[PDB]
């Protein structure tokens, strides 16, 4: 039981770091929006498939 609790503790920090460094990936790639509801990655459009 003790060892299982310790493992859960460690997994918490693992997921914390995962989201931490996934938040920094927005510093490189921005996803944006404007009033007409078009979307831009790095300022270039990408409409829906159709």
């Amino acid at each position: 039981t003790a060892k299982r609790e310790l493992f859960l503790k460690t997994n918490a920090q693992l997921t914390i770091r995962c989201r931490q460094l996934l938040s920094e990936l927005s510093y490189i790639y921005p996803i944006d929006l404007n009033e007409h509801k078009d979307y831009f990655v790095c300022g270039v459009k990408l409409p829906n498939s159709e």
Binding site: K3, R4, L6, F7, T10
Partner: protein, 51 residues
């Protein structure tokens, strides 16, 4: 001869008692071993996940 036969009968009674106790003890051992094996498996699994 009669006394010897009576002593043998009592010995048989005690043998039956011992046999019943053995059966109960074996059931207990079975249950314990089941739990022990399951615990060892779970212990190893948790250790691997930790690593």
């Amino acid at each position: 001869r009669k006394i010897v036969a009576e002593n043998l009968e009592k010995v048989q009674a005690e043998a039956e008692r011992l046999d019943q106790e053995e059966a109960q003890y074996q059931r207990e051992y079975s249950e314990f071993k089941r739990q022990q094996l399951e615990l060892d498996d779970e212990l190893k699994s948790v250790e691997n996940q930790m690593r």
